[PDB]
Amino acid sequence: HTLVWGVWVNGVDQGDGRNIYIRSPPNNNPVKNLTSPDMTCNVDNRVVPKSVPVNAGDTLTFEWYHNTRDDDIIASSHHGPIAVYIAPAASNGQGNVWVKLFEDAYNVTNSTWAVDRLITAHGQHSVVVPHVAPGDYLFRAEIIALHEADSLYSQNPIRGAQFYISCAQITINSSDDSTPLPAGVPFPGAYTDSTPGIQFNIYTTPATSYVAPPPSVWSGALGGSIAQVGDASLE
Numbered sequence: 107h108t109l110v111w112g113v114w115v116n117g118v119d120q121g122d123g124r125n126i127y128i129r130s131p132p133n134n135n136p137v138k139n140l141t142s143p144d145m146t147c148n149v150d151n152r153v154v155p156k157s158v159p160v161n162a163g164d165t166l167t168f169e170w171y172h173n174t175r176d177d178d179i180i181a182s183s184h185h186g187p188i189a190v191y192i193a194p195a196a197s198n199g200q201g202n203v204w205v206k207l208f209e210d211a212y213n214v215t216n217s218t219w220a221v222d223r224l225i226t227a228h229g230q231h232s233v234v235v236p237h238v239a240p241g242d243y244l245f246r247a248e249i250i251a252l253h254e255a256d257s258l259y260s261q262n263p264i265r266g267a268q269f270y271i272s273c274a275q276i277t278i279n280s281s282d283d284s285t286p287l288p289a290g291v292p293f294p295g296a297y298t299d300s301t302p303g304i305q306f307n308i309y310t311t312p313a314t315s316y317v318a319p320p321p322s323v324w325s326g327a328l329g330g331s332i333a334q335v336g337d338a339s340l341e
C-alpha cells in the first residue's frame with residue numbers, strides 16, 4: 107500500500123503533487139484485476155490541473171509514501187519490481203501507447219528486490235527524461251508487490267500480484283527529439299494471466315529465477331536509479 111507524494115527535477119522538489127500534477131487515486135489500495143480499466147492510471151484517471159515542466163536529460167525522481175511523507179514508504183513484505191512507462195498525454199493512456207523507460211526487478215549482486223531498495227531510498231526512484239518530441243506526457247510508475255502472487259487474482263481475488271500505479275503529468279519543453287517515441291503496449295492488456303512475472307511464488311521460487319513482465323525497456327531509454335535524490339527532512 108503506497109502512493110506518489112510528488113516528484114523532484116534535477117534534485118529540486120516540485121512540492122506536493124497529490125491531485126495537482128499526480129492523477130492520484132483516493133487511497134493506497136492496489137489494482138489487481140489485469141483486465142481492469144484501472145490498470146491504466148489507477149482508479150481515478152482524469153486530467154489534473156498542473157503538468158511538471160522538464161527538459162530532455164533532466165533527472166525525474168518519483169517519491170512514494172505509505173501513510174505520511176517519508177515514512178516506511180511500503181510494507182517490507184511487498185517485495186517486487188519497479189517499472190516506469192511513458193505515453194503521450196493526449197492518449198489519456200488508452201491504446202497501444204505505453205513505452206517502458208525503466209525496469210528493476212531482483213538485483214543478484216545486492217540480493218535485493220527493487221521495492222527493498224525503494225524503502226532504503228526514502229521512496230525515491232528516478233529516470234532520465236528521454237529525447238522525445240516536446241509536449242505533454244504521462245509517466246506511469248508501477249510497483250508490483252509479489253508477496254501474494256503465487257495465485258492469479260483471476261483464480262483467487264483475495265490474492266494476486268498487486269499493482270501500485272501512479273500517473274504523473276509531465277511536460278517536456280526542451281528536447282531535440284533524437285529518439286522519437288514509438289507505439290507501445292496497452293494497459294490494461296500488456297499483462298495477462300500467462301505473462302512472465304505476474305504469477306510468482308516468492309516463498310518457493312528463488313528470486314534469482316524471476317523474469318519481470320515484458321515489454322522490454324525501449325532502446326531510447328537513458329536509464330535511471332533507485333536512490334535518494336533529495337532530503338525531504340530539510341524542508
Ligand SMILES: [Cu+2]
Binds near residue numbers: 107108181184
Ligand atoms: Cu499493501
